[PDB]
Design a protein around this ligand. Structure first.
Ligand SMILES: [K+]
Ligand SMILES: [K+]
Ligand SMILES: [K+]
Ligand SMILES: [Mg+2]
Ligand SMILES: [Mg+2]
Ligand SMILES: [Mg+2]
Ligand SMILES: [Mg+2]
Ligand SMILES: [Mg+2]
Ligand SMILES: [Mg+2]
Ligand SMILES: [Mg+2]
Ligand SMILES: [Mg+2]
Ligand SMILES: [Mg+2]
Ligand SMILES: [Mg+2]
Ligand SMILES: [Mg+2]
Ligand SMILES: [Mg+2]
Ligand SMILES: [Mg+2]
Ligand SMILES: [Mg+2]
Ligand SMILES: [Mg+2]
Ligand SMILES: [Mg+2]
Ligand SMILES: [Mg+2]
Ligand SMILES: [Mg+2]
Ligand SMILES: [Mg+2]
Ligand SMILES: [Mg+2]
Ligand SMILES: [Mg+2]
Ligand SMILES: [Mg+2]
Ligand SMILES: [Mg+2]
Ligand SMILES: [Mg+2]
Ligand SMILES: [Mg+2]
Ligand SMILES: [Mg+2]
Ligand SMILES: [Mg+2]
Ligand SMILES: [Mg+2]
Ligand SMILES: [Mg+2]
Ligand SMILES: [Mg+2]
Ligand SMILES: [Zn+2]
Lengths: 51, 44, 155, 110, 49, 64, 118
RNA sequence: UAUUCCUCAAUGACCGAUAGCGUACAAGUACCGUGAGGGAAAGGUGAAAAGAACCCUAUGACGGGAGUGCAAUAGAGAACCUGAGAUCCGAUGCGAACAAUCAGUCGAAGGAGUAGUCAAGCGCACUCACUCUAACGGCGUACCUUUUGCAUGAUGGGUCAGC
């Protein structure tokens, strides 16, 4: 996506290719990350950190 | 409130007048100092 | 021959901000449309800007041979003048500094180009389009002429 | 430094930093310090750009930069990184020839 | 409370932006007396008043 | 009126803070006013729903 | 000289025969000016007198450019060095060099694109 | 031999309108104080007033023409030679309402305006042409003083001109 595999790479331009990812529900996850990895975010109100 | 300057012409002439300054030795030096400086109003 | 004709009024006893607030309304307007808008704008500076625009049209007509029906307001700007310094007295023995202001007004007019006349004719046809500020100042209002009629049989 | 010479260098500065001598003298000196530092930082920035382009050109044929540059060192080919990157961008077949020569020289592990 | 810093020209102009005047959409002039007026303003009554 | 606050006393020395809200935060940690703080503003004229309200009678001739 | 065409055309030497700041440029004319004229046949050397002013060397080029170097209070070696600098220059404006390799065809085999096959 | 309330003549590597006496100008004035006392500010049209007859628009010319004059922004009523800066209002070109920070520096797509050279066939490609703007990327916590040590939430400074 960064177009870092093209020999005409320039950092200040956007010339990456288009990535089409198939079968996203069959991605592999190792270990116990299904029940031990969390996504957390704060909604701006005090005491409202969500996981 | 009652301010400090309460005017009275006879009191002014009796304290800072020409013949009140001319009466004592300090006032005569005041008159000499005023004339030497060049004041228009030598006395009050 | 002469492209631009100006008229300057000095020593107006008002604020430059207050005068410029009305002077910025009429920039880029036609003269006979600005004169009509200044007669329905309720401000103190409206009479002054009316006088200066009137004098500019008169100068262009009389001295330099320009056509009064085809004048447009190229520029209209405000400069400072001789400010008068007085003292304002507050409570508790303090003071500030008060200013009585004075300004000058300059109005510059020119003849409308034939291309701009074609623009005005294109703008006066009916369309639903959003107008930019230049086109809106070129076509500012709808002028309606009415006659008084006594005993128009109704209410 | 002169006042007018600072007012020439503060040309194009936003705000009161192009009119007032007290404000313009501070911002001009910071600009001169940035220019002095960036005369040294430009060299590192450009060399990193060359390495990125050489690596991108070389990995197309399956050879890493680290193997490719050491193969050209082993074959006593003394083209520097700037010229190599320009070759990768503008002469793809000569760069492919250089990649093949370097692969025959130093294949590395893996 | 006092202002902590000086208000720059950029911020002063942004503040005074929306307060500028706007033109009037409809203007009427009487054909007889020639007065320029807004709608719903009375100037003249016709003849035989 | 909006949030049924108590306000301040009507006597005993209180000066010009009879119906004001009082404090609006703690000092310096956090150093800011929290979101959702109860403050004066426009009241009512919003949409509300009343649940479990009982139908007593029906007049189909007049649709009442 | 741009593609064989010499760009400096006129070299004006303005001096003064009375003032003390023109001693170096005066002594430059007897010593180094004939050698410069003899070794530069294509160049035109003009001599001007301006009493009571400071001396200078003015170079006038083909692209309608004038470059003036004031040579007050200088030595003949410095005056000759600045005359040589005037001769060796194309008369272009003194700005930063953007590129040190000027080309109009950057590629012979064609610039790499996405649709390049090997 | 000492001094200058005084007079006459002369000199200055003394000053030149924030300087020189407090006072280049009706100053120990105006103004402040009960009083003793304190104590300012403010120079210049043009060679000569020839200081703008007359016309137009406004209540009113200080405006726009006309005329005098070398010159009129050289057009003033204790002020008009030159006319800098902070500051205010406009015009032209580019950026600018989905993107944050001592506001720059190093690269830079694009947009806009404008030049010249001459061999060859009066085109066209050459001058990295030149000037203004800068989407986007990397990097970047003001200055002075005082300190073992300050982006410091330690001091000082609203800005400009003169001293
Ligand atoms: K003049
Ligand atoms: K940047
Ligand atoms: K403190
Ligand atoms: Mg009051
Ligand atoms: Mg009082
Ligand atoms: Mg103030
Ligand atoms: Mg004020
Ligand atoms: Mg209670
Ligand atoms: Mg109560
Ligand atoms: Mg109370
Ligand atoms: Mg109280
Ligand atoms: Mg003085
Ligand atoms: Mg002066
Ligand atoms: Mg003065
Ligand atoms: Mg008195
Ligand atoms: Mg007059
Ligand atoms: Mg003169
Ligand atoms: Mg300015
Ligand atoms: Mg603009
Ligand atoms: Mg955008
Ligand atoms: Mg921001
Ligand atoms: Mg740059
Ligand atoms: Mg460009
Ligand atoms: Mg172009
Ligand atoms: Mg950063
Ligand atoms: Mg300490
Ligand atoms: Mg120390
Ligand atoms: Mg630090
Ligand atoms: Mg601080
Ligand atoms: Mg701070
Ligand atoms: Mg201290
Ligand atoms: Mg402070
Ligand atoms: Mg200063
Ligand atoms: Zn009417």
């Amino acid at each position: 996506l960064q177009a870092k595999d093209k020999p005409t790479y320039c950092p200040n331009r956007d010339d990456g290719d288009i990535c089409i990812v198939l079968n996203a529900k069959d991605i592999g996850i190792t270990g116990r990350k299904l029940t031990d990895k969390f996504y957390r975010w704060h909604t701006g109100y005090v005491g409202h950190l969500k996981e | 409130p009652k301010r400090t300057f309460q005017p009275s012409t006879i009191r002014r002439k009796r304290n800072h007048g020409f013949f009140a300054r001319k009466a004592t030795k300090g006032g005569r030096r005041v008159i000499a100092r005023r004339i030497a400086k060049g004041r228009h109003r030598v006395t009050a | 021959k002469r492209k631009k004709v100006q008229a300057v009024l000095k020593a107006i006893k008002q604020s430059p901000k207050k005068v410029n607030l009305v002077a910025a309304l009429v920039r880029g307007m036609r003269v006979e449309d600005a004169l009509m808008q200044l007669q329905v704008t309720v401000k103190r500076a409206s009479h002054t800007v009316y006088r200066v625009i009137h004098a500019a049209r008169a100068n262009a007509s009389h001295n330099h041979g320009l056509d009064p029906d085809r004048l447009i307001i190229a520029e209209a700007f405000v400069g400072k003048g001789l400010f008068k310094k007085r003292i304002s007295i507050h409570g508790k023995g303090k003071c500030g500094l008060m200013i009585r202001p004075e300004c000058r007004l300059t109005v510059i007019v020119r003849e409308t180009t034939p291309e701009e006349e074609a623009e005005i004719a294109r703008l006066k046809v009916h369309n639903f389009k959003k107008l930019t500020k230049r086109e809106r100042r070129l076509n500012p209002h709808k002028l309606i002429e009415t006659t008084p009629i006594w005993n128009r049989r109704g209410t | 430094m002169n006042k007018k010479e600072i007012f020439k260098l503060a040309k194009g500065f936003r705000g009161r930093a192009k009119n007032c001598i007290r404000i313009a003298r501070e911002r001009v000196e910071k600009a001169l310090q940035y220019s002095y530092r960036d005369r040294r930082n430009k060299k590192r920035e450009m060399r990193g750009l060359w390495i990125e382009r050489i690596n991108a050109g070389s990995r197309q044929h399956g050879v890493n930069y680290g193997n490719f540059i050491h193969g050209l060192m082993k074959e006593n080919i003394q083209l520097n990184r700037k010229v190599l990157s320009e070759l990768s961008m503008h002469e793809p077949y000569s760069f492919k020839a250089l990649v093949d020569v370097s692969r025959n020289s130093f294949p590395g592990n893996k | 409370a006092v202002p902590k810093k000086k208000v720059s020209k950029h911020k002063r102009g942004i503040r005074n932006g929306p307060k500028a005047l706007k033109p009037v959409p409809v203007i009427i002039r009487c054909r007889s007396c020639g007065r320029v007026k807004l709608p719903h303003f009375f100037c003249c009554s016709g003849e035989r008043g | 009126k909006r949030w049924k606050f108590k306000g301040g006393p009507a006597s005993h020395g209180c000066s010009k803070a009879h119906r004001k809200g009082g404090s609006t935060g703690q000092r310096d940690d956090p150093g800011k006013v929290f979101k959702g703080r109860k403050m004066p503003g426009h009241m009512g004229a919003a949409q509300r729903t009343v649940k479990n309200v009982w139908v007593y009678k029906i007049d189909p001739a007049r649709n009442l | 000289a741009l593609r064989g065409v010499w760009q400096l055309q006129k070299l004006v030497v303005s001096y003064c025969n009375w003032g003390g700041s023109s001693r170096g440029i005066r002594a430059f004319m007897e010593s180094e000016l004939p050698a410069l004229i003899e070794k530069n046949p294509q160049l035109e050397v003009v001599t001007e007198l301006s009493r009571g002013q400071h001396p200078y060397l003015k170079g006038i080029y083909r692209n309608r450019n004038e470059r003036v170097v004031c040579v007050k209070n200088m030595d003949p070696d410095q005056v000759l060095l600045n005359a040589t600098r005037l001769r060796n220059s194309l008369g272009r404006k003194v700005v930063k060099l953007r590129t040190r390799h000027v080309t109009k065809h950057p590629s012979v085999q064609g610039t790499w694109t996405t649709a390049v096959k090997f």
